[PDB]
Structures are given as C-alpha cells and as structure tokens.
Design a binder for these strands. Sequence first.
RNA 1: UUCCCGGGCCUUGUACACACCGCCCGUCACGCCAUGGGAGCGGGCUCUACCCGAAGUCGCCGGGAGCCUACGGGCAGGCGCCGAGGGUAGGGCCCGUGACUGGGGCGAAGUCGUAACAAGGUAGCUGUACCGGAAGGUGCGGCUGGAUCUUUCU
RNA 2: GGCUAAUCCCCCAUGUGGACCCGCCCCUUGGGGUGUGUCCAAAGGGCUUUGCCCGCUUCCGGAUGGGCCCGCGUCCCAUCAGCUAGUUGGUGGGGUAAUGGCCCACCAAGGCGACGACGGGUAGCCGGUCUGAGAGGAUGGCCGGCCACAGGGGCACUGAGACACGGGCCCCACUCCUACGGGAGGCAGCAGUUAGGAAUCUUCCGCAAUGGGCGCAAGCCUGACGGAGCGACGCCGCUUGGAGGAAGAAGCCCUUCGGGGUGUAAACUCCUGAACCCGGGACGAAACCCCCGACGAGGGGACUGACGGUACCGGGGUAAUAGCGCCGGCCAACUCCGUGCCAGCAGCCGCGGUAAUACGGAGGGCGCGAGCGUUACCCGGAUUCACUGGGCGUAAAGGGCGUGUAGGCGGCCUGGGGCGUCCCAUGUGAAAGACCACGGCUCAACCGUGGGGGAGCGUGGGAUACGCUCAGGCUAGACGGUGGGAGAGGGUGGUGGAAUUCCCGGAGUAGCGGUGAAAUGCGCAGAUACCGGGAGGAACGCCGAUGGCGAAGGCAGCCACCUGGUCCACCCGUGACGCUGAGGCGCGAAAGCGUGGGGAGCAAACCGGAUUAGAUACCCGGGUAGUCCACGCCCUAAACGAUGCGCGCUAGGUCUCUGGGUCUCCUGGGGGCCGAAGCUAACGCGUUAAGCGCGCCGCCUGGGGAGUACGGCCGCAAGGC
Lengths: 124, 138
Amino acid sequence: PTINQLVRKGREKVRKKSKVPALKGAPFRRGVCTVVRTVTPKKPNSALRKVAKVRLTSGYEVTAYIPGEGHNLQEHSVVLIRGGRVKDLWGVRYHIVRGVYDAAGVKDRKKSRSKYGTKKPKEA
Amino acid sequence: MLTDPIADMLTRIRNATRVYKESTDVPASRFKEEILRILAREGFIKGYERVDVDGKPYLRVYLKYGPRRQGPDPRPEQVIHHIRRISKPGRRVYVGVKEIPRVRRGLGIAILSTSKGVLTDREARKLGVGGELICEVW
RNA sequence: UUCCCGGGCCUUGUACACACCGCCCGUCACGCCAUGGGAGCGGGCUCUACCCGAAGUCGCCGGGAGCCUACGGGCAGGCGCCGAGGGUAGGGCCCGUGACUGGGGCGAAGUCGUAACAAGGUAGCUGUACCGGAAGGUGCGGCUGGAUCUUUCU
RNA sequence: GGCUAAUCCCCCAUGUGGACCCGCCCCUUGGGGUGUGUCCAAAGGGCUUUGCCCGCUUCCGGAUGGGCCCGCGUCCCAUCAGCUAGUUGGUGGGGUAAUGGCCCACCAAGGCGACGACGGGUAGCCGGUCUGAGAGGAUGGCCGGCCACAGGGGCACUGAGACACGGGCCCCACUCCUACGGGAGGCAGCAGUUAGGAAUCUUCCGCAAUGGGCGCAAGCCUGACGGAGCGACGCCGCUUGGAGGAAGAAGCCCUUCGGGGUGUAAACUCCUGAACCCGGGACGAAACCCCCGACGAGGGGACUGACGGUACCGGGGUAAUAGCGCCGGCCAACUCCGUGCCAGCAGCCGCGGUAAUACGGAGGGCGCGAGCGUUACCCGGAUUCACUGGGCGUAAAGGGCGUGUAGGCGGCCUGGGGCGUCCCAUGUGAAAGACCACGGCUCAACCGUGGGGGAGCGUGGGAUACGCUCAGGCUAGACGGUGGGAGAGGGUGGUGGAAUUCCCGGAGUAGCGGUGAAAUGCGCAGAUACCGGGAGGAACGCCGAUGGCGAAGGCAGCCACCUGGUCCACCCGUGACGCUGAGGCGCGAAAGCGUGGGGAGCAAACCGGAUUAGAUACCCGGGUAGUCCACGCCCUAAACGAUGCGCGCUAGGUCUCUGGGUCUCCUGGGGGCCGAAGCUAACGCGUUAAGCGCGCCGCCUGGGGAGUACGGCCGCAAGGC
Ligand SMILES: [Mg+2]
Ligand SMILES: [Mg+2]
Ligand SMILES: [Mg+2]
Ligand SMILES: [Mg+2]
Ligand SMILES: [Mg+2]
Ligand SMILES: [Mg+2]
Ligand SMILES: [Mg+2]
Ligand SMILES: [Mg+2]
Ligand SMILES: [Mg+2]
Ligand SMILES: [Mg+2]
Ligand SMILES: [Mg+2]
Ligand SMILES: [Mg+2]
Ligand SMILES: [Mg+2]
Ligand SMILES: [Mg+2]
Ligand SMILES: [Mg+2]
Ligand SMILES: [Mg+2]
Ligand SMILES: [Mg+2]
Ligand SMILES: [Mg+2]
Ligand SMILES: [Mg+2]
Ligand SMILES: [Mg+2]
Ligand SMILES: [Mg+2]
Ligand SMILES: [Mg+2]
Ligand SMILES: [Mg+2]
Ligand SMILES: [Mg+2]
Ligand SMILES: [Mg+2]
Ligand SMILES: [Mg+2]
Ligand SMILES: [Mg+2]
Ligand SMILES: [Mg+2]
Ligand SMILES: [Mg+2]
Ligand SMILES: [Mg+2]
Ligand SMILES: [Mg+2]
Ligand SMILES: [Mg+2]
Ligand SMILES: [Mg+2]
Ligand SMILES: [Mg+2]
Ligand SMILES: [Mg+2]
Ligand SMILES: [Mg+2]
Ligand SMILES: [Mg+2]
Ligand SMILES: [Mg+2]
Ligand SMILES: [Mg+2]
Ligand SMILES: [Mg+2]
Ligand SMILES: [Mg+2]
Ligand SMILES: [Mg+2]
Ligand SMILES: [Mg+2]
Ligand SMILES: [Mg+2]
Ligand SMILES: [Mg+2]
Ligand SMILES: [Mg+2]
Ligand SMILES: [Mg+2]
Ligand SMILES: [Mg+2]
Ligand SMILES: [Mg+2]
Ligand SMILES: [Mg+2]
Ligand SMILES: [Mg+2]
Ligand SMILES: [Mg+2]
Ligand SMILES: [Mg+2]
Ligand SMILES: [Mg+2]
Ligand SMILES: [Mg+2]
Ligand SMILES: [Mg+2]
Ligand SMILES: [Mg+2]
Ligand SMILES: [Mg+2]
Ligand SMILES: [Mg+2]
Ligand SMILES: [Mg+2]
Ligand SMILES: [Mg+2]
Ligand SMILES: [Mg+2]
Ligand SMILES: [Mg+2]
Ligand SMILES: [Mg+2]
Ligand SMILES: [Mg+2]
Ligand SMILES: [Mg+2]
Ligand SMILES: [Mg+2]
Ligand SMILES: [Mg+2]
Ligand SMILES: [Mg+2]
Ligand SMILES: [Mg+2]
Ligand SMILES: [Mg+2]
Ligand SMILES: [Mg+2]
Ligand SMILES: [Mg+2]
Ligand SMILES: [Mg+2]
Ligand SMILES: [Mg+2]
Ligand SMILES: [Mg+2]
Ligand SMILES: [Mg+2]
Ligand SMILES: [Mg+2]
Ligand SMILES: [Mg+2]
Ligand SMILES: [Mg+2]
Ligand SMILES: [Mg+2]
Ligand SMILES: [Mg+2]
Ligand SMILES: [Mg+2]
Ligand SMILES: [Mg+2]
Ligand SMILES: [Mg+2]
Ligand SMILES: [Mg+2]
Ligand SMILES: [Mg+2]
Ligand SMILES: [Mg+2]
Ligand SMILES: [Mg+2]
Ligand SMILES: [Mg+2]
Ligand SMILES: [Mg+2]
Ligand SMILES: [Mg+2]
Ligand SMILES: [Mg+2]
Ligand SMILES: [Mg+2]
Ligand SMILES: [Mg+2]
Ligand SMILES: [Mg+2]
Ligand SMILES: [Mg+2]
Ligand SMILES: [Mg+2]
Ligand SMILES: [Mg+2]
Ligand SMILES: [Mg+2]
Ligand SMILES: [Mg+2]
Ligand SMILES: [Mg+2]
Ligand SMILES: [Mg+2]
Ligand SMILES: [Mg+2]
Ligand SMILES: [Mg+2]
Ligand SMILES: [Mg+2]
Ligand SMILES: [Mg+2]
Ligand SMILES: [Mg+2]
Ligand SMILES: [Mg+2]
Ligand SMILES: [Mg+2]
Ligand SMILES: [Mg+2]
Ligand SMILES: [Mg+2]
Ligand SMILES: [Mg+2]
Ligand SMILES: [Mg+2]
Ligand SMILES: [Mg+2]
Ligand SMILES: [Mg+2]
Ligand SMILES: [Mg+2]
Ligand SMILES: [Mg+2]
Ligand SMILES: [Mg+2]
Ligand SMILES: [Mg+2]
Ligand SMILES: [Mg+2]
Ligand SMILES: [Mg+2]
Ligand SMILES: [Mg+2]
Ligand SMILES: [Mg+2]
Ligand SMILES: [Mg+2]
Ligand SMILES: [Mg+2]
Ligand SMILES: [Mg+2]
Ligand SMILES: [Mg+2]
Ligand SMILES: [Mg+2]
Ligand SMILES: [Mg+2]
Ligand SMILES: [Mg+2]
Ligand SMILES: [Mg+2]
Ligand SMILES: [Mg+2]
C-alpha cells in the first residue's frame, strides 16, 4: 500500500484469542465434578481416556482430563483445573491437578512425581 | 511529465549499465547535474556532458564498467552495483547530521541535498550539516 | 488388428499415490458441541414529555401576626427558582430464561445414492430462473480453469 | 431562664499606608504613578516589669504552594454519521481570588463533523518497566510526580486554603440500639476478622533516628516513619566438606559369561571447622539543653536508643540438608525389564496391536541445584499488519467499467520570502531508574558521590540545495488549430434477400417424421416431397480473419440522418492548464420484475414416447413463461488478460490492421507470435512486462464455519451491497 495509504489507514494490530477461558484470568480454578467417565479419542488412536465434567468457581462448565495411572475422583468431588489440552480428545481444554483437594497423587509412581503429584518414596 | 525526474535519472543509469551501454541521455537540469558531478568525482561514471537532442537540453552520461571476465558470462563487473532513491516525492526523508548513514561500511556513498549544496555523506559530516537524503549508491 | 484377454513404447488429462477394487460430494439414521430465528415472560439502562420533590445556596417578603435594636437594620419564619431522588406515559437499546424452529460443526462408523476428479461415462464451471425433499437437472447468456442410447459396485 | 472573662464580638479615634468612584500622566487587556471625595486598622500576654521577649494591625516586596488559560501529544468499533437549545456568539448583570454561558435576563442564528463530530466499548495518566538488533510491541505493581474517590447520590458551612477519608446537612442501601416515637454508625489508615479466590503477612517493638502539628520553652501528640516478625515471592552472597584413597570391595544394573558400568564414588587415612558454647560488644547521636559570649557569631561542655546484647571482633568447637526436570526429533542424555492400539504418553509431528532409546519401573545418563518443574499472562521468534520490513496472472488479494469531488503527487529557467528542512547558542528535559567512573557494607545484591547522554518543546541567531510559497519566464507534458484517415463505437428512421412457420391455389399418393433401434406425433378432412401466391416474426449467409471498434458490458445485411472516441501529417496557437482519485453520479451480458405490446423459430416449467433394475435425467414428439419492441426497475457474472490508471526507461526477429514518407525499407498508432537483459515457486512474462523506476487508488493476512448470522442502506419482488 502506498505511504499515503498507510497514513490514511495504517496497519492493524492482531488481537489474540484465549485458548483457555478457565479464565477470570486465573492460572488455576477450583471446581466440582459433575460426571466422571471415559471417552474414545480421535481417529488415529484408541484407548479409554479418563475425564470429568466440572462446574467452576468461574461459573463455567468444562471437560477435564484426569492424568495418571489410577484415579480416585468421584461424582461429587472438588478439584483443581490446570489448563492445557488433550490433543486426540474433543474439546478437553484442561487437566486436573493431582495431589490437591480430592484428587490424590498417583499411587506408586517413582519417576516424574511433580506432574501426577506424589510425594517421595521410602528407602531401605 | 516525469513524476520524479531524479528517480528517473537514476533509473536510466541503472538500466543503461545493466545492458552495458556506453552512454545514456537524461533530460537536463541543474540538480541532476549536481548529482552527476558527485558521481563523476566519486568514480561511478566516467563523466557527463551537455548535449542538444532535438534541440532540447540533455545530459549525456558516460558509464563505466569492469574488465572483461572469464569462464561462462565474460560480462564485466558493474562500477555501479546499486543506485537507489531514498527520499521520493510522497515520502521525503530528511536527516540531521547525527543521522547521515554510513553506506556499505564506507565503500558506498549517500548523496544529500543540503543548504550548503549537494554533498556526499562524508562531505556533509565534515561540513557538519544535514539535509534531504537523496539516494544510496554503491 | 476392428473387437475380447494379457502386455510393451510415446503422448495427454488427473482432485488418484494403500495408487480407479482410487477419491470426494451428498441424503437418512445415530452421539456430542457451538450457534441463528424466536411467542411469551424476569431484571437493567437511556432519552423525551408531564407530576411530586429532601438538603442547601441564592432571590423576594419578613406584615399593630413573633425575638433583638443605638430605629440604621439583624434573627426567626414564610414564599419562589434551582435541585438529589420517586412516580406516570410512551420511544429506543442491552443482558436473562425460553415453547417451537434453521442450519453448522465434529464424531465410532452405519444407511442408501453416483453429482465432481480420466472426454468421470451428458465436458466442467458460472450469474440468473424454474423444477426435486436433496444430490442435482434443465433454460438463457458467459468462461476454458475442456479431452481426442443406457450399462453398477468394491 | 440567669450570672461572666478574654488575644471573643462591636463603636468613635490616629491614616504610614491601603480600598473604591471620577479626572490626568506613562504603559498598553484589569500594569504603574497622581490628585480631590469617601471608606478601612490593632491585643494583649510573659518576664529579673525602665528594658527585653512572645505576640497584634496596615502596607510593599520576597519566597513557597495553588487556581484558571492556550499549542501539541494521549486505546478500540463507522455494523455509531450526522451531533447541538446555554446550543454558538453578542450587550448588560450575577458570581468568584480571578477569565469564562460559570449562571440569568434580552438580542442575533449560530457552533461541531469523514482531519471521524455524536454514539458504544474499555481505561486513571506519567517518570518508567518487560521484551526487542533496532523500529516497535506490551505494561504502568512497588518507589517519585499529577489526577480522582472515601458505602451510593446531591449539597454547602467553616476557613488562607475543603465542597473536606477518622467535619456537617439531606436522600438511598445496609448493620446495630429502641420504651416503637425514635436514634447510632462508615478500616480504599495500622494491625486484625470475615466472605469471595488459584493467592497475598503480626491485632509486634519503638519516639532512639528522619520528618510533621502545637508550645517561649519544658514538653505533648505522630500505626508518617525507623525497625522486628511471617511467606525460597524476587535478587545476591553462603553451606552440605578438603586432600590422599583400588591394574579398582560389596550391593545394584548391562553381559557375546570373556567382561563392562555406577567409580575415588564408598570404606578408610589425615586435615579444615557451617552449626554451637563462652567472652567482649557497636556504628547509626548530635542538636534540643548547660557554661563563657550579648539568648547572636564563635568557643567549649553534658543527657539521649526500638532494632539488641543484634551485627561484628576474640577463644573454644562437631564431617555436618539434596533435590527437581528431562534423556524419539526440535534438544544435552540409552540400555534392560514389564505392558501388548491395553494401560498410558502428548508442546508439535507422533508413540503403544510382542525387540517400545516415546507408556511404567529399574540401571545409567544429561541439565539445573535450595531449588526444579507446571499453569496462566506479556514481548520474542513473527519479515505472520512488513516505517525499518510483505504482498495481489494461476497460492489470500485489482474494484464490472467510467466520469470526476475531497485529498495525495507535480516539467524547465530566474528572483523574493524562509513555513517544512538543516546548523549554532540557549532555557527546559525534577529525583529515582538506565549508562560510565570512583567509593561504602569482608563480596555481591543494596547503597552513596560524581560525570555523561537524551528525543521533544520554548527564545535568539544563521543556511537556502531540496519541498512550500509569491512574482516572472520557456515549451519537451497537456489541450487547441489546419489538413488527412480507418472503424460491427452509439441513437433514430427506413429498406433487402435467403430460410422457418402458417394461410390460399395447382399438381400429386401413402406415407412422412424421428432414433442406436424405436415409439409417441402428423397423414384418406389427402400429409411428406414439387410449383405458384400471401401473411407474419426473428436473425443477418458469402465477405469474415489468426480482422476492426468501444472505458467496460458489448457491437456484424444495405441506406440516410444525428453523434462519441481515436490515429497520422503540418509544427501553426495556448503556456504546466498535469496524473490519480475515498465519496458522489452515470454505464453496466444474461436471467429476472412491472405496465403495455408482439409472437415466426427456439424453449426452463409442463404434458407425453422410448432407454434403463428404476427416470424426475441424457435421446424422441409437443409445449407455456421467456426469448422480440416501448417505457420504468433489477446492478449480478469465469463482468477474465482471473493482470487498476498514468508516465519514463531497458536487444531483436516475425505475421498483421491502419496512417505518413524520398513506400525494398523507414517512421507513427493498434493486434498477435517467438525471444535480449531481467523477472518468477514453478508455469511463465519479456517495448501490448509479470523487467527497471515514480505517483495515486483498490484489495489481501491459514482452511472451514461463510459471502452465512445480526445490523444498516437499496429494491415492487427476486434479491443486492
Ligand atoms: Mg459465563
Ligand atoms: Mg551505447
Ligand atoms: Mg528534528
Ligand atoms: Mg489391450
Ligand atoms: Mg519396446
Ligand atoms: Mg517407462
Ligand atoms: Mg497413459
Ligand atoms: Mg484439465
Ligand atoms: Mg493423497
Ligand atoms: Mg488409496
Ligand atoms: Mg417542581
Ligand atoms: Mg430564611
Ligand atoms: Mg422543575
Ligand atoms: Mg436451537
Ligand atoms: Mg459421476
Ligand atoms: Mg454433471
Ligand atoms: Mg460429466
Ligand atoms: Mg445453470
Ligand atoms: Mg424448493
Ligand atoms: Mg428436471
Ligand atoms: Mg451452457
Ligand atoms: Mg482456483
Ligand atoms: Mg475447464
Ligand atoms: Mg443401468
Ligand atoms: Mg441565656
Ligand atoms: Mg442558656
Ligand atoms: Mg456586665
Ligand atoms: Mg477582634
Ligand atoms: Mg475609623
Ligand atoms: Mg497618604
Ligand atoms: Mg508568586
Ligand atoms: Mg453486528
Ligand atoms: Mg438545556
Ligand atoms: Mg472561598
Ligand atoms: Mg459576562
Ligand atoms: Mg480537524
Ligand atoms: Mg475503571
Ligand atoms: Mg533492553
Ligand atoms: Mg500506556
Ligand atoms: Mg506511585
Ligand atoms: Mg463519589
Ligand atoms: Mg455518603
Ligand atoms: Mg459519596
Ligand atoms: Mg471531595
Ligand atoms: Mg476511618
Ligand atoms: Mg474461600
Ligand atoms: Mg509487613
Ligand atoms: Mg520522633
Ligand atoms: Mg523530631
Ligand atoms: Mg513556634
Ligand atoms: Mg515501616
Ligand atoms: Mg575426598
Ligand atoms: Mg564388575
Ligand atoms: Mg580437630
Ligand atoms: Mg556518637
Ligand atoms: Mg550512637
Ligand atoms: Mg549572660
Ligand atoms: Mg554554639
Ligand atoms: Mg567465632
Ligand atoms: Mg580455631
Ligand atoms: Mg559424611
Ligand atoms: Mg539428541
Ligand atoms: Mg513424560
Ligand atoms: Mg513381552
Ligand atoms: Mg519388550
Ligand atoms: Mg513397534
Ligand atoms: Mg524407555
Ligand atoms: Mg520423550
Ligand atoms: Mg521412559
Ligand atoms: Mg538416575
Ligand atoms: Mg541462591
Ligand atoms: Mg512483528
Ligand atoms: Mg524481528
Ligand atoms: Mg496472523
Ligand atoms: Mg512496507
Ligand atoms: Mg520509525
Ligand atoms: Mg505475504
Ligand atoms: Mg478489470
Ligand atoms: Mg486537485
Ligand atoms: Mg519540482
Ligand atoms: Mg525557518
Ligand atoms: Mg537543548
Ligand atoms: Mg536523570
Ligand atoms: Mg544518580
Ligand atoms: Mg530498554
Ligand atoms: Mg567495594
Ligand atoms: Mg543504582
Ligand atoms: Mg528559531
Ligand atoms: Mg536567501
Ligand atoms: Mg528559492
Ligand atoms: Mg501542492
Ligand atoms: Mg509561471
Ligand atoms: Mg481533424
Ligand atoms: Mg456501427
Ligand atoms: Mg449504428
Ligand atoms: Mg418468405
Ligand atoms: Mg394446399
Ligand atoms: Mg387437389
Ligand atoms: Mg390419420
Ligand atoms: Mg393415426
Ligand atoms: Mg410455397
Ligand atoms: Mg401471426
Ligand atoms: Mg465466418
Ligand atoms: Mg467477451
Ligand atoms: Mg463518426
Ligand atoms: Mg467521428
Ligand atoms: Mg510552435
Ligand atoms: Mg509565447
Ligand atoms: Mg480518472
Ligand atoms: Mg468512484
Ligand atoms: Mg444489466
Ligand atoms: Mg434481459
Ligand atoms: Mg417482461
Ligand atoms: Mg419445438
Ligand atoms: Mg421414460
Ligand atoms: Mg424437449
Ligand atoms: Mg486469485
Ligand atoms: Mg474479482
Ligand atoms: Mg500494483
Ligand atoms: Mg511485434
Ligand atoms: Mg504506405
Ligand atoms: Mg506494435
Ligand atoms: Mg533469460
Ligand atoms: Mg528458470
Ligand atoms: Mg514471451
Ligand atoms: Mg515502452
Ligand atoms: Mg520504446
Ligand atoms: Mg508498464
Ligand atoms: Mg508475480
Ligand atoms: Mg478462521
Ligand atoms: Mg450473492
Ligand atoms: Mg422494502
Ligand atoms: Mg443469489
């Protein structure tokens, strides 16, 4: 565009759209399980993925992954939403944080403890 | 009507040299002459002379090239590799003295028009004045 | 040497490359997600017109209808304008829930079509118009972004 | 209701001076001087009471701190385009410290807006901060400056100053008290409670320091502050040892059973001595005050701590926390086992269905280390909104075409001005921060002192090339004149022949027609084929091109009239009159709409016949709208060169249309094809540029959702933008 054209009109700044209205801006959000169930992932993969419906302190309702080996979450439990997606599932935009509230850390996991929220084992 | 006679002259030179013409006619004016004189002194052209084509003033510009080359494509190096208008009608750039740019680490030149007259970058700095930044050449 | 089967070479088109036993479009059904229209109803704002109108400032009166007085006036008090806010009437706009309804998006992968890609088997595309529930068909005009009877499916 | 003091209130006086009206002078907005008239002052207290202190009154100036005013800069939406009645201005007045529609009266009819008014959304602004090579983007916590608010809203009083957080009045909501009449409250002060939340501290110490208020002082007050406490929240320093120690223990892992690894790692040897105990133990503090001096200057002298018995110094003195992420590629680090499209992983591509360096554990390894990861958010990368620094023939992207408004841009020569532009000086650019230097805490973080830099703006001076401007001049652009052209360019009227259909007549039988083959259909009321005549409508064979014209859509028989564009020669006239062009306005194939006509052929819809598994379709027989004319709408398109307009510049060859020329050829203007340089992702483009440049307009920013929804404008509707 001619310079006079930019003076007239000017470049336009590109707005960014939130991939996560966990929101109220927050990093994490407390919520309550509605359903706890499994789902069947996208085309190239097969498994039973573990998810939960959550009502939120934000007054929001979202599907959340329940990462780990075992999971104790039940229908009425309270839980902390992490954010970040599960790619081969549908519209699951958030993960549940293990170790806090009613979601206990993965039983007997020795390697990456922080993700999965389990404390340090014992030594002989 | 040329919309930018200066850009037009520079471009004529560019096209001329790119086909290895011995010389090129640009329609004459004082300002064009000053720009030329600068080139000629800097060695980008052999020189220029005034001439009447169809009883009209023109500046005939004698271009300058490298020695013949070897291998495929014997065509010689250009003495003017790069000739470019900076300030154009419709965006006119003017620089202060602290802003007069070093061109190609000194191997090139910038031509400014100042109230001391048409200078090169070095000329302008040493004279301590800025002005309109006309073109880059290298 | 036309034809049938298999094959070789050159060329052309191709949306195929698991490579035509290919690909894609589309319909009905099944599962979820977001959305449009939307009767009626819940709350909000805003303007305009009219009515009510606190406090206070200002203006007027302040009178043998009050208080003070050095008779110059002062205070109390009354009235008025303004005025927060309230009501009424209508106009406009924003959320909320919403009977009923339109497509859309995905999804295991089912259903029946065979429109498009090879001249895809009626060349395709297109604006418009009519017909069909829809894919599509046809009319008219345009484009080359076209190759040298019917007769399926994998 | 009554008593009473004052530095409380009021009256006369003195008028240094001052205020006001009027006159005069100088300055020029209401600044300064002057004269007459008028009007306005005061407060007392303490002392060693003969002199001094603390005060009081009027005036002039200073200083500091504010009010008001102007230029410029200050986010998103045009699906917000028109907004405005004290609105815009005037005279007079009110009000204030003061200008002002700040307010009222009267008069005029104005003011603002595409350079974005009005509307909606969001938001305290800045010094700075984060990021970035920079430009830029993002942000404004803490600290400094300004603004604003003190539960919501309005209002004023008091005062130098407020429309007043811990002042007042009223209204509303809320909490409490209530004898039901009525009252009381305001932590966005410190600390603390509670609710909400992913989440944010002690109801600490102290007036010792700095600062603030009052007081002559002594002194009092100060949740400002100076500290301490809590939280790896950040930054910085420090520790978990140091040296010796195997041709290399055990355990654990790999094993080709030969061995390889963890690894000098450990044990162990020696050495040092974080923690810890003892002792000493601050700086921050010198004034206020006392003495001499005159309550001064000067000189001298003494009191004064939360932090704290802390930091620190001296003596003693124990080997004394390590974890967290990763190890398929991006990316530094590989093997074994378990699991078998499971369980799981996952930032992206992807990994897992029997050898998994990708899941889980183990060994080992890499990276950081009192931390390491994660999520969220900002810049980055992203040249992915491209000023630096991008694009549009086929990838997204040239507007259907024109006319032109605003605006943007502008040939050659001369002169004036000096607005842009440039240069010097100067003021401003607070402090903090950033930078540099030196220094202070053992270092650093942190801090001090100093230096420099700095866009922008104000004032003064200078320069004149370029841009602007004014004045003059030229003719190379542009238009004109004269004289030649070629043309399906447009409008109007007329006219010609071939053909189809129908009607009339002659002659003439038995079929014609149609398809792959057929059938419907037409023919004994005589068709088809042949001849003659009539009527009507629509379109123009050959010429015809690989041609011409037009801005595009588009334009083809012949004739006449009206009319647009354009090319060449002459070089005659004007003298930059130019280019582009948001809006606007006009044109705009076909189909479609309205009112009237017209109707031969063709023909969506439709009615039939075949083909087919089926048919709505492809083929066949009919057939209405429509196609044609008038007038008025519609405004789309593969409206295509999928290529905006103009200008200059950069090899040729070849065919062609149309001018001029001394006509092989050359010289203009068109249409094509190959191809220089060059360009391009390639295909291709190449003097008809997709090359090299300049001006202006339009347009693009992953694919879908979608040219959809909502809004608005237009339209009779369809539907368009
Ligand atoms: Mg919500
Ligand atoms: Mg030459
Ligand atoms: Mg500057
Ligand atoms: Mg064969
Ligand atoms: Mg062979
Ligand atoms: Mg081969
Ligand atoms: Mg072949
Ligand atoms: Mg093709
Ligand atoms: Mg493929
Ligand atoms: Mg395949
Ligand atoms: Mg009233
Ligand atoms: Mg009264
Ligand atoms: Mg009223
Ligand atoms: Mg619905
Ligand atoms: Mg097909
Ligand atoms: Mg078809
Ligand atoms: Mg076809
Ligand atoms: Mg069609
Ligand atoms: Mg229909
Ligand atoms: Mg049909
Ligand atoms: Mg067609
Ligand atoms: Mg395409
Ligand atoms: Mg085609
Ligand atoms: Mg069949
Ligand atoms: Mg009394
Ligand atoms: Mg009393
Ligand atoms: Mg008395
Ligand atoms: Mg008094
Ligand atoms: Mg007196
Ligand atoms: Mg006097
Ligand atoms: Mg002052
Ligand atoms: Mg909208
Ligand atoms: Mg009004
Ligand atoms: Mg006042
Ligand atoms: Mg006035
Ligand atoms: Mg303006
Ligand atoms: Mg706000
Ligand atoms: Mg930086
Ligand atoms: Mg900002
Ligand atoms: Mg601050
Ligand atoms: Mg308020
Ligand atoms: Mg209040
Ligand atoms: Mg309030
Ligand atoms: Mg206030
Ligand atoms: Mg308070
Ligand atoms: Mg809570
Ligand atoms: Mg604290
Ligand atoms: Mg103190
Ligand atoms: Mg003090
Ligand atoms: Mg005092
Ligand atoms: Mg403090
Ligand atoms: Mg050692
Ligand atoms: Mg071993
Ligand atoms: Mg020892
Ligand atoms: Mg001391
Ligand atoms: Mg001390
Ligand atoms: Mg004495
Ligand atoms: Mg002294
Ligand atoms: Mg010690
Ligand atoms: Mg020792
Ligand atoms: Mg040890
Ligand atoms: Mg690697
Ligand atoms: Mg992992
Ligand atoms: Mg196995
Ligand atoms: Mg295995
Ligand atoms: Mg495998
Ligand atoms: Mg592994
Ligand atoms: Mg991995
Ligand atoms: Mg692993
Ligand atoms: Mg390890
Ligand atoms: Mg550290
Ligand atoms: Mg960028
Ligand atoms: Mg960059
Ligand atoms: Mg983008
Ligand atoms: Mg650019
Ligand atoms: Mg810049
Ligand atoms: Mg691009
Ligand atoms: Mg076009
Ligand atoms: Mg103009
Ligand atoms: Mg010029
Ligand atoms: Mg100047
Ligand atoms: Mg300066
Ligand atoms: Mg500074
Ligand atoms: Mg400093
Ligand atoms: Mg910086
Ligand atoms: Mg030091
Ligand atoms: Mg510093
Ligand atoms: Mg100046
Ligand atoms: Mg001069
Ligand atoms: Mg001049
Ligand atoms: Mg101009
Ligand atoms: Mg002139
Ligand atoms: Mg003529
Ligand atoms: Mg014609
Ligand atoms: Mg005609
Ligand atoms: Mg006839
Ligand atoms: Mg007959
Ligand atoms: Mg007969
Ligand atoms: Mg019959
Ligand atoms: Mg019959
Ligand atoms: Mg006949
Ligand atoms: Mg007829
Ligand atoms: Mg022909
Ligand atoms: Mg055409
Ligand atoms: Mg004509
Ligand atoms: Mg003519
Ligand atoms: Mg002449
Ligand atoms: Mg003349
Ligand atoms: Mg134009
Ligand atoms: Mg226009
Ligand atoms: Mg049309
Ligand atoms: Mg039509
Ligand atoms: Mg009609
Ligand atoms: Mg027919
Ligand atoms: Mg049939
Ligand atoms: Mg038919
Ligand atoms: Mg395109
Ligand atoms: Mg287009
Ligand atoms: Mg362009
Ligand atoms: Mg040619
Ligand atoms: Mg000739
Ligand atoms: Mg030509
Ligand atoms: Mg080439
Ligand atoms: Mg190439
Ligand atoms: Mg070519
Ligand atoms: Mg050219
Ligand atoms: Mg040329
Ligand atoms: Mg061109
Ligand atoms: Mg290109
Ligand atoms: Mg998208
Ligand atoms: Mg459309
Ligand atoms: Mg309508
Ligand atoms: Mg349509």
